[PDB]
Amino acid sequence: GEVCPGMDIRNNLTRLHELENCSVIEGHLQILLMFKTRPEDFRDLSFPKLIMITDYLLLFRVYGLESLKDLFPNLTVIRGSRLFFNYALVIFEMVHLKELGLYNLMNITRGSVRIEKNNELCYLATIDWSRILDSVEDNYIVLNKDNCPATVVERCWTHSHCQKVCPTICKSHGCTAEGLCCHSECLGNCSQPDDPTKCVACRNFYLDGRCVETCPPPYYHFQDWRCVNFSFCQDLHHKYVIHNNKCIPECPSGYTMNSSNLLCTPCLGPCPKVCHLLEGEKTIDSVTSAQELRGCTVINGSLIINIRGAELEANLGLIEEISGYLKIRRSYALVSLSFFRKLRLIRGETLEIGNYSFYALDNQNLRQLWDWSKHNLTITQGKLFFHYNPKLCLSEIHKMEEVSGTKGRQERNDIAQASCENELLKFSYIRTSFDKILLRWEPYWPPDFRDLLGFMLFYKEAPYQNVTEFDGSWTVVDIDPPLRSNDPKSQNHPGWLMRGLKPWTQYAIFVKTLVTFSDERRTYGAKSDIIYVQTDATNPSVPLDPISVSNSSSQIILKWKPPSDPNGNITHYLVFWERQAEDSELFELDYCLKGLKLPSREEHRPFEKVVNKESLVISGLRHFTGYRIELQACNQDTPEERCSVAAYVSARTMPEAKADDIVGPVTHEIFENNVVHLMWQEPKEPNGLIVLYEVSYRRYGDEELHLCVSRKHFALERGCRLRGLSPGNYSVRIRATSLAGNGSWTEPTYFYV
Amino acid sequence: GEVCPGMDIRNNLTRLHELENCSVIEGHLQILLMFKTRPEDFRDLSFPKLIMITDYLLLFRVYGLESLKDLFPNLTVIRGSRLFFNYALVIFEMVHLKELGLYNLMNITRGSVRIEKNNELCYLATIDWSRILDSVEDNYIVLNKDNCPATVVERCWTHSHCQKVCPTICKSHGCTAEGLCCHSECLGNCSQPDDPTKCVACRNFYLDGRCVETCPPPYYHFQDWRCVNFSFCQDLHHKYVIHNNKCIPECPSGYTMNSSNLLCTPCLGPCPKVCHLLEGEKTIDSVTSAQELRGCTVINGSLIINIRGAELEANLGLIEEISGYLKIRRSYALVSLSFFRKLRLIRGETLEIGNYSFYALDNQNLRQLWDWSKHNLTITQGKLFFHYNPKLCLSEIHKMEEVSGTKGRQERNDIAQASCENELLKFSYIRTSFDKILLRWEPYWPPDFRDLLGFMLFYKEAPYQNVTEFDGSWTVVDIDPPLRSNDPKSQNHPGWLMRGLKPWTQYAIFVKTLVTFSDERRTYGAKSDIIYVQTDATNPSVPLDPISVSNSSSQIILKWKPPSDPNGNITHYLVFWERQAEDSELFELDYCLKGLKLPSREEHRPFEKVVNKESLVISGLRHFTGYRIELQACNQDTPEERCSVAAYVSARTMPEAKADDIVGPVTHEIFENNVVHLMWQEPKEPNGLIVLYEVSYRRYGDEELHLCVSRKHFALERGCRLRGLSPGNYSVRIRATSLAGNGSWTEPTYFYV
Amino acid sequence: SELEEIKKLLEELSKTDPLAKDILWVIEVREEDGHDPESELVFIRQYLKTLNEPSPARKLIESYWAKKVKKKAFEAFMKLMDALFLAKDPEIKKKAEELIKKLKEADEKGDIEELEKVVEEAEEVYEKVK
Amino acid sequence: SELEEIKKLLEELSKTDPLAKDILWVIEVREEDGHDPESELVFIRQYLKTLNEPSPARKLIESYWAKKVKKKAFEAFMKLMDALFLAKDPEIKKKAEELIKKLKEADEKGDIEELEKVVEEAEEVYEKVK
């Protein structure tokens, strides 16, 4: 067989002859408007070589077609990878079609058939689309004329040829033209049974006449249809890309390729994307336009900003160079033009009338243009215009002139409320408590000292030295002038402090003067520098999430998480654990009450300066022994340590099921009056403590019986004193029962009673 | 004596002769700059009639004064009600004063003396200011020449006359010139002892030669000094006010008087206060100026607003009429001019150049001027100016013209971005869930249907129909156009809904169209009317703060507060209470264990539809009987009631200390073998239940002893069966012990054992 | 019909989610007032879109709307082809050809919004032929 | 001195309030750096004023500042009277008389702020005589 691309034929049946040397249509067939055609044309014109399509058939107004079977006798699979409006097949409006007739179609991997408005079109209810198609939700079929398996009714394309339905055991894997199940990797039909190298379709991926699950390199995928060597994709691209072993058309987002390295390596996040706006131009007045141009890492064409008034910087700040000019006009709420993080060089290739590479008008809100301390913005050429916008002072425009390299391209006719603080205000004193900070600065007086209307002070948390003065947010309060204070010294140094500030957090602080807006020449005033002050460190918050799990009998692991409010670098966690004696009620009362009524109730605590270990492994404890734990957290080590108040947990070690029995046998003595006295010693390292011991005493011929001997019973009777004993050899087994549970029975103690 | 006002003398000792007929200086003396004077003048000039000052003395550069005693021999009290810089007395810089000498000063009700820079001024350390003055924190005395009680040292103004200190028993009430304690109502000194009608001063209030605690009408107070009839204050006012029985100078805030009714009746909150600004003019550019003119219920003079951009309305909206014109200029951030609640009539008496009674320029944010649906603003005369402010449409200015009555005083030259929605948008459908509301409206298309850029929808909670469209706040979201939808019907009716809205809360809703700003004639679009929609009512929150206090043995009062979230008019509280039998462990186990181990542990619940009674008085219960209570709250009665899930409380009635004893005596029987069997019946309405009964049995000669008979013991022995009894008459008393406590012992049951 | 099973699926989703509960409430309140469920279906899909939340299950169900419009576009295309072969004016024929190309390209990109915007123009052009 | 008892009173208040604690901290941090406690006293009163909270106990203590300025105004007045009687220029004499009247009126209203603003001018005028 031979492969071909996909083409559509229109009113010229001559073109149809090109498929004689074809086997697969790497695309979609199409026929429509065959008015010139007559039944004498297609009654026998055939192209049996065709064996499988990939996107979709179609027909329309095909005058002359008697039976479609005469065309595609061997057509077997319509992959429907690309659908004509979710329709794999589409027949439409041919009056000469007596029957579809195609007796080899065997799967429609996608979509759904569609047949309509056809006269003489018979054999419709006899086609079991459920068997062939894979989803039959819409086999839209209306306005029509309407041996082998029957499903109440026999199914057949034609009375001479039925549907080629075979036993279900063949599954979608398909079955021979004679009806024999094929290899799993095959689809529809196989020339030989169970032979992946002898079937026409391929469920996963065709390869060199063999049904396989992937292609081998240098032969990668190809539109999830076949396998082609690398050179094929390279030639196609020369006139395609390589990625994930898949020679897909174009690589996905966040990727790009090199001419030599066809494989598209990941880009740096923002991948180069030149955007040619409508006619290389555009206007921005709403966030909608910015979103429509979101992520244009590069631009080619002038851009005009005329906007009302974070989102913009999300949709902007993506370009290093703009081919055309940039313009801002009438956008009267532009606090500053720093929405252009990347903007580096206005190419000015497209120049505005008058040869201007910039323009600002009716925007008396431009507090600033950029952070020129760092921003290396450049301009290739072009004049500039900033009329009716003297809200920003001419010093900023001069900085424009220097940094942009436009010194010989500007004039005062580019500029026209002015509030450039011509003086500087120097802080004279600042102290830092753990939550409050003092402020003092030189007592600035304008030459018309009467004018001053009190200073204005601003601050905000600044975990990193970014500071966006003139952007907005932040800003808090203002102050009034102290008093004239007359003359030399003793000016009173106007100041202010703040109260509610979190400890150990860098704070950015600066004070500007709010002077009366004198219409005549105004001594704009002093704008203090921007300073960073970090308050002190107080004692932290209590350590949090302390859980004293037990991993071993005599070992405890304590897991805790960093305190919710560190309020200071946590130098080291201080952990104190102490062993606690059991409750007095758990050591004094009696505990042998039948129907157990067991009560259900310098101090160098051994400590370690755990460092960075949020979960401690305590060692040296005693199994199931009372322990009072504590978690001291501090953020200061060498001087007086600000160790916050500790949390608490009374962890109990997991018990040992070896050190809870009666160590050794049970001492005893016998009396001639059928009385036996018992004695023993409890372990010195029990599971916390042993309150009661289970006794079990037996006589030969009789059966074992149990008696309870508590600590009080032990002391009163020096252990136990059995009474009511029958003559004969005896046997006694005793098991200690600590709080954890019953231990181990003692060795059978034998005597005569 | 005779009263006078207070006057100051300067360099003319002639004026001093006016005090010969004076007794009290209703004010403050003053002498200073007596350079022309010589010692030959004041060496014997005297005015003994003076007996008491009210505000303060003073002296300065008095050349000639040898001894101050020669002037005020009888001066006794310096009330110091009005102080010369917190100083009652003030001597200063007289070189001729050998000694103060005044030997009658007896109290300084306020302030503190002050003497300085005086040569020859002796007898300073000998004046016990602690005794005379009332606070001696600052008796500032520096740069000076410096028989009777001594305080280590004798105290004396002069070697010939001491301080007139008398026994402490006289207290500040004072003592005679001879040193005898006076009436309590007197001060300093009294001509007769214990006679309020015979003393010179008066601690509280002088009256017709008496010492009293208040003045009688029509004689009210007078500068907390004396008592004067009403006509006196009236004459003074004619040239003062009346209030709180005190003829004080001017009435306090929130008060005002009438010419006929001298008493200042309370005003209506904002009292008439005409404010004459500086030169009858002013400018407002900051909140500081507004605060400086806060509360000017009336104004007299033109006002000019040139402000940057609630507080203003707090400081404004106080005036009905402005004498001069009002002007707004360059205040670009004036959303609307509705900060003037009271403003009713611009008098326009002061007219701007060109005879303009209004002015608006460079303020393109004036969304509106006033709520002209109601505001009956008027203008007397004057032209108007609204150039460079076409952000508000000319229809609003026309409304200005009609309502202000300035039709023949305006021209188009008073007016110049325009966004007056010339069409109206009608809501077509709205439904209300308990928290979500649907919205639909006619599909408005501008003549250039392509222009439309999606509608904008706003809403906010409106508990009262106020709605401040164009003020700011509120406003939430926007929508996009549905689709062209071609032609007739099936336009798809663009709509939107909200999810998170609280039940039963009126909501104000309106939708405006956000159309592209076409520079040419723009079909501004449709601005929908403002509608109020109230969501539905869901089930309320659980009733809160339920406390089942007990007020009587068999009665319970239950107090609960309205549920935190009514979410619907609370039609009536539904209360269910049920009696609960005691715990099975409290009815089955034994309860006579010595060393009491008493365990410390259709269903028409009787209900009432309590209406408006947040605290119920339940009745019919049983003292100290288990009861399960439940508070059902509903906000819907006749249909399916949305009765929220009830709270719960298991109230226990307070016990009866009458129905907890053993009702009746104790039945018993005797046996010949020194055995006695007891029997009795417990009350059928105990304090919940009686679990144990305290027995007490006695024999003559012996003493009473107690035995416990539980319910199990009762049943097993049919009560009790005493054993081990000695011969002789017996006596048994038994007291039931319910859960509340021990009841009452039974009648002594007598028998022989 | 398909709408009924869609209601059932949204009901099952509602038992686990609030959004689907609100969707079903909208469906019911529109049903009880005698209005086409499909108009409310397109409107509710539009509301979901404007909400912009991921809410993947609900948007995945609304993909049924994409299915419906994709089917409708086929009828629109067929009408346009009939008009193009039988249009009374050459300029109408050129506009019809342009619309056919636009429809094919819009389907090629698999963009539903363009499909809607182009089927509207398709009906507008078809108005002239009939 | 009076400042020491004021510190003690503010300390006692601090034991019950946070504001007084901050006040005492300010006093201490200024003391330790060698600065006049009275300058910090006027500044801290100004800060309390600008805070605008009622905080009645602290403002009532700061009324000590009103006492101090009221005393100072007496010295200012006395200087101005000496200059007025001994001023070298008639215009200076008229200005001194105006200032004296202003001082008396400001005390009459019991307004401390005007007292400060006028004592400043008083010192300015007194500069000329000496």
Question: Do D76 and D24 share a domain, yes or no?
Answer: no
Chain A residues in contact with D22 (beta carbon < 8 A): 436, 497, 499
Question: Do B310 and B375 share a domain, yes or no?
Answer: yes
Among A37, A1, A27, CA closest to A16: A37
Question: Do A119 and A240 share a domain, yes or no?
Answer: no
Distances (CA, A) of A453 to A515, A519, A522: 5, 15, 13
Helix, strand, or coil here: B257? coil
For A138, the closest chain C residue by CA position comes to C71
Residue B202: inside a domain, yes or no? no
**Phi and psi of B595, rounded to 5°?**
65, 70
| Beta carbons of A320 and A288 less than 8 angstroms apart | no
Question: Do B20 and B155 share a domain, yes or no?
Answer: yes
Which pair of structure tokens corresponds to residue A59?
């027909």
Question: To which residue do tokens 């944010």 refer?
Answer: B365
Question: Do C70 and C120 share a domain, yes or no?
Answer: yes
Which pair of structure tokens corresponds to residue A37?
């055609």
Q: In angstroms, rounded to a whole number, what is the distance separating the alpha carbons of residues D48 and D30?
A: 17
**Chain C residues interacting with chain A (CB cutoff of 8 angstroms):** 67, 70-71, 73-74, 77-78, 81, 85, 107
Helices and strands of chain A, counted as H and E runs: 7, 42
Q: In angstroms, rounded to a whole number, what is the distance separating the alpha carbons of residues B644 and B343?
A: 50
Chain C residues in contact with B438 (beta carbon < 8 A): 26, 29
Looking at residue B743, the DSSP 8-state letter turns out to be E
CB contact under 8 A, A517 and B453: no
Q: In angstroms, rounded to a whole number, what is the distance separating the alpha carbons of residues B469 and B335?
A: 11
C-alpha angle with apex A361: A356 to A365, nearest 5 degrees? 130
First to last CA, chain D: 32
- Give the number of residues written for chain C: 130
Helix, strand, or coil here: B702? coil
**B413 Cα distance to chain centroid:** 53
Q: In angstroms, rounded to a whole number, what is the distance separating the alpha carbons of residues A331 and A237?
A: 46
Q: In angstroms, rounded to a whole number, what is the distance separating the alpha carbons of residues A302 and A347?
A: 10
Report whether the peptide linkage leading into residue A546 is cis, meaning its omega lies within 30 degrees of zero.
no
Which pair of structure tokens corresponds to residue C8?
């059932």
| Beta carbons of A163 and A128 less than 8 angstroms apart | yes
Among A71, A66, A70, CA closest to A22: A71
Helix, strand, or coil here: B314? helix
Q: In angstroms, rounded to a whole number, what is the distance separating the alpha carbons of residues B129 and B115?
A: 13
DSSP B383-435: B--BTT-TTS-HHHHHHHHHHHT-GGG--GGGB-------B---EEE--B-SS
Question: Do A373 and A437 share a domain, yes or no?
Answer: no
Rg (CA), chain B: 46
| Beta carbons of A304 and A281 less than 8 angstroms apart | yes
DSSP A290-309: HHHTTT-SEE-S-EEE----
Q: In angstroms, rounded to a whole number, what is the distance separating the alpha carbons of residues C26 and C46?
A: 13
Q: In angstroms, rounded to a whole number, what is the distance separating the alpha carbons of residues B378 and B671?
A: 114
Among A28, A33, A27, A30, CA closest to A12: A33
Distances (CA, A) of A624 to A551, A648, A658, A743, B612: 12, 18, 12, 13, 59
Residue C61: inside a domain, yes or no? no
Among B42, B47, B50, B53, CA closest to B6: B53
Q: In angstroms, rounded to a whole number, what is the distance separating the alpha carbons of residues B544 and B177?
A: 73
Q: In angstroms, rounded to a whole number, what is the distance separating the alpha carbons of residues A622 and A689?
A: 10
Q: In angstroms, rounded to a whole number, what is the distance separating the alpha carbons of residues B86 and D64?
A: 12
CB contact under 8 A, C85 and A114: no
* Distance from the C120 Cα atom to the nearest Cα atom in chain B, whole angstroms: 6
Question: To which residue do tokens 């010419």 refer?
Answer: B259
| Beta carbons of A558 and A618 less than 8 angstroms apart | yes
| Beta carbons of A122 and A94 less than 8 angstroms apart | no
Which pair of structure tokens corresponds to residue B654?
């307070």
Residue type, A724: G
Q: In angstroms, rounded to a whole number, what is the distance separating the alpha carbons of residues B133 and B406?
A: 70
Structural element, H or E, at residue A699: strand A690-699
How many other C-beta atoms are found inside a 10 Å radius of the C-beta of residue B677?
A: 15
Angle between helices D90-109 and D112-129 (to 10 degrees): 160
Residue C121, domain extent: 66-129
Q: In angstroms, rounded to a whole number, what is the distance separating the alpha carbons of residues A320 and A341?
A: 8
How many other C-beta atoms are found inside a 10 Å radius of the C-beta of residue C63?
A: 12
Q: In angstroms, rounded to a whole number, what is the distance separating the alpha carbons of residues B286 and A539?
A: 44
Q: In angstroms, rounded to a whole number, what is the distance separating the alpha carbons of residues B48 and B30?
A: 17
Which pair of structure tokens corresponds to residue A76?
């077997």
Q: In angstroms, rounded to a whole number, what is the distance separating the alpha carbons of residues A72 and A70?
A: 6
- Per the entry, the structure determination technique was cryo-EM
Looking at residue A705, the DSSP 8-state letter turns out to be B
Q: In angstroms, rounded to a whole number, what is the distance separating the alpha carbons of residues A621 and B537?
A: 62
Helix, strand, or coil here: A671? strand
Question: Do B516 and B550 share a domain, yes or no?
Answer: no
Residue C58: inside a domain, yes or no? no
Sheet holding B495-498, edge to edge: B427-429, B437-441, B495-498
Distances (CA, A) of A190 to A128, A182, A205, B313, C23: 21, 6, 15, 89, 50
Residue B1: CATH number of its domain: 3.80.20.20
**Phi and psi of A36, rounded to 5°?**
-60, -30
| Beta carbons of D102 and D118 less than 8 angstroms apart | yes
Q: In angstroms, rounded to a whole number, what is the distance separating the alpha carbons of residues A677 and A581?
A: 31
Helix, strand, or coil here: D8? helix
Q: Say yes or no: B480 contacts chain C, CB-CB below 8 A.
A: yes
Which pair of structure tokens corresponds to residue B657?
């200390």
Q: Say yes or no: B122 contacts chain C, CB-CB below 8 A.
A: no
Number of domains in chain B: 6
How many other C-beta atoms are found inside a 10 Å radius of the C-beta of residue A434?
A: 16
| Beta carbons of A592 and A709 less than 8 angstroms apart | yes
Q: In angstroms, rounded to a whole number, what is the distance separating the alpha carbons of residues B278 and B297?
A: 17
Which pair of structure tokens corresponds to residue B549?
């206090």
Which pair of structure tokens corresponds to residue A460?
């905000």
Mutation site for D-interface testing, chosen from B10, B85, B94 by largest number of D Cβ within 10 Å: B85
Chain B residues in contact with A285 (beta carbon < 8 A): 517
**Phi and psi of A270, rounded to 5°?**
-80, 105
- Give me the total of CB pairs closer than 8 Å, taking one residue from chain A and one from chain D: 38
Which pair of structure tokens corresponds to residue B69?
């005693």
Boundary (domain end) residue, out of B534, B562, B581: B534
For A453, the closest chain B residue by CA position comes to B288
Question: Do B25 and B159 share a domain, yes or no?
Answer: yes
Chain B residues in contact with C25 (beta carbon < 8 A): 433, 436
**Phi and psi of A62, rounded to 5°?**
-80, 95
| Beta carbons of A230 and A220 less than 8 angstroms apart | yes
C-alpha angle with apex D80: D79 to D82, nearest 5 degrees? 65
Burial of A80 (0-12, 13-18, 19+ CB in 10 A): buried
Resolution in Å equals: 4.0
- Give me the total of CB pairs closer than 8 Å, taking one residue from chain A and one from chain B: 6
How many other C-beta atoms are found inside a 10 Å radius of the C-beta of residue A225?
A: 17
Residue type, A484: R
Reported as half-sphere exposure (CB side, CA atoms, 13 A), residue B206 has a value of 20
Boundary (domain end) residue, out of A587, A620, A649: A649
Residue type, A370: W
Question: Do B682 and B743 share a domain, yes or no?
Answer: yes
Distances (CA, A) of A53 to A12, A57, A105, A673, B210: 21, 8, 11, 109, 128
Residue A662: inside a domain, yes or no? no
Question: Do B130 and B13 share a domain, yes or no?
Answer: yes
Residue B194: inside a domain, yes or no? no
First to last CA, chain A: 106
How many other C-beta atoms are found inside a 10 Å radius of the C-beta of residue A715?
A: 9
Q: In angstroms, rounded to a whole number, what is the distance separating the alpha carbons of residues A274 and A296?
A: 7
Q: In angstroms, rounded to a whole number, what is the distance separating the alpha carbons of residues A249 and A417?
A: 57
Residue D95: inside a domain, yes or no? yes
C-alpha angle with apex B653: B648 to B655, nearest 5 degrees? 155
DSSP B117-177: EESS-B--TTS-HHHHBS--TT--EEEE-----B---B--SBTTB------GGG-TT-B-T
Q: In angstroms, rounded to a whole number, what is the distance separating the alpha carbons of residues C50 and B456?
A: 12
- Which chains touch B (3+ CB pairs under 8 A)? A, C, D
Mutation site for C-interface testing, chosen from B429, B483, B485 by largest number of C Cβ within 10 Å: B483
Residue A148: inside a domain, yes or no? yes
Q: In angstroms, rounded to a whole number, what is the distance separating the alpha carbons of residues A16 and A41?
A: 11
| Beta carbons of A112 and A79 less than 8 angstroms apart | no
Q: In angstroms, rounded to a whole number, what is the distance separating the alpha carbons of residues A494 and A483?
A: 9
Residue C98: inside a domain, yes or no? yes
Helix, strand, or coil here: B712? helix
Q: In angstroms, rounded to a whole number, what is the distance separating the alpha carbons of residues A673 and A752?
A: 11
Residue D81: inside a domain, yes or no? yes
Among B87, B79, B45, B49, CA closest to B62: B45
Question: Do B32 and B96 share a domain, yes or no?
Answer: yes
Q: In angstroms, rounded to a whole number, what is the distance separating the alpha carbons of residues A363 and A333?
A: 7
How many other C-beta atoms are found inside a 10 Å radius of the C-beta of residue B483?
A: 17
Mutation site for C-interface testing, chosen from B438, B440, B476, B486 by largest number of C Cβ within 10 Å: B486
Question: Do B144 and B30 share a domain, yes or no?
Answer: yes
Helix, strand, or coil here: A129? helix
Looking at residue B521, the DSSP 8-state letter turns out to be S
> Which of B285, B453, B517 lies closest to A517 in CB terms?
B285
| Beta carbons of B327 and B354 less than 8 angstroms apart | no
Residue B596: inside a domain, yes or no? yes
Residue A100: inside a domain, yes or no? yes
Chain B residues in contact with D74 (beta carbon < 8 A): 84-85, 87, 114
**Chain A residues interacting with chain B (CB cutoff of 8 angstroms):** 285-286, 288, 453, 517
> Which of D67, D71, D85 lies closest to B33 in CB terms?
D85
Burial of A72 (0-12, 13-18, 19+ CB in 10 A): buried
Question: Do B300 and B262 share a domain, yes or no?
Answer: no
Sheet holding B556-561, edge to edge: B544-547, B556-561, B615-618
Mutation site for D-interface testing, chosen from A483, A489, A498, A536 by largest number of D Cβ within 10 Å: A483
For B433, the closest chain C residue by CA position comes to C25
Q: Say yes or no: A86 contacts chain C, CB-CB below 8 A.
A: yes
Q: In angstroms, rounded to a whole number, what is the distance separating the alpha carbons of residues A143 and B26?
A: 119
Residue B263: CATH number of its domain: 2.10.220.10
Q: Say yes or no: B499 contacts chain C, CB-CB below 8 A.
A: yes
Residue A659: inside a domain, yes or no? no
Q: Say yes or no: A56 contacts chain C, CB-CB below 8 A.
A: no
Pairing of strands A77-78, B742-745: unpaired
Which pair of structure tokens corresponds to residue A485?
């204070």
Question: Do D78 and D119 share a domain, yes or no?
Answer: yes
Q: In angstroms, rounded to a whole number, what is the distance separating the alpha carbons of residues B384 and B124?
A: 75
Q: In angstroms, rounded to a whole number, what is the distance separating the alpha carbons of residues A609 and B45?
A: 92
Residue type, A347: R
Residue A676: CATH number of its domain: 2.60.40.10
C-alpha torsion sign, points A611, A616, A617, A620? positive
**Phi and psi of B366, rounded to 5°?**
-70, 85
Which pair of structure tokens corresponds to residue A147?
């041996």
Q: Say yes or no: A87 contacts chain C, CB-CB below 8 A.
A: yes
Q: In angstroms, rounded to a whole number, what is the distance separating the alpha carbons of residues A11 and A29?
A: 14
Residue A422: inside a domain, yes or no? no
Question: Do C86 and C122 share a domain, yes or no?
Answer: yes
> Which of B480, B487, B492 lies closest to C42 in CB terms?
B492
Question: Do B334 and B410 share a domain, yes or no?
Answer: yes
Among B675, B662, B557, B693, CA closest to B618: B557
CB contact under 8 A, B433 and C42: no
Residue A694 makes CB contacts below 8 A (sequence gap 6+) with A706, A708, A734, A735, A736, A737, A742, A745
D and C touching (3 or more beta-carbon pairs closer than 8 Å): no
| Beta carbons of B663 and B570 less than 8 angstroms apart | no
Question: Do D76 and D39 share a domain, yes or no?
Answer: no
Reported as half-sphere exposure (CB side, CA atoms, 13 A), residue A86 has a value of 21
Which pair of structure tokens corresponds to residue A51?
């064996």
Looking at residue A582, the DSSP 8-state letter turns out to be P
Q: In angstroms, rounded to a whole number, what is the distance separating the alpha carbons of residues A646 and D44?
A: 37
CB contact under 8 A, D50 and A499: no
Residue B606, domain extent: 544-649
* Distance from the B601 Cα atom to the nearest Cα atom in chain A, whole angstroms: 15
Question: Do C32 and C70 share a domain, yes or no?
Answer: no
Which pair of structure tokens corresponds to residue A163?
């549907």
**B227 Cα distance to chain centroid:** 35
Question: Do D44 and D70 share a domain, yes or no?
Answer: no
Question: Do C79 and C125 share a domain, yes or no?
Answer: yes
Question: Do D7 and D43 share a domain, yes or no?
Answer: yes
Mutation site for C-interface testing, chosen from A81, A85, A89 by largest number of C Cβ within 10 Å: A85
Residue type, B324: G
Number of domains in chain D: 2
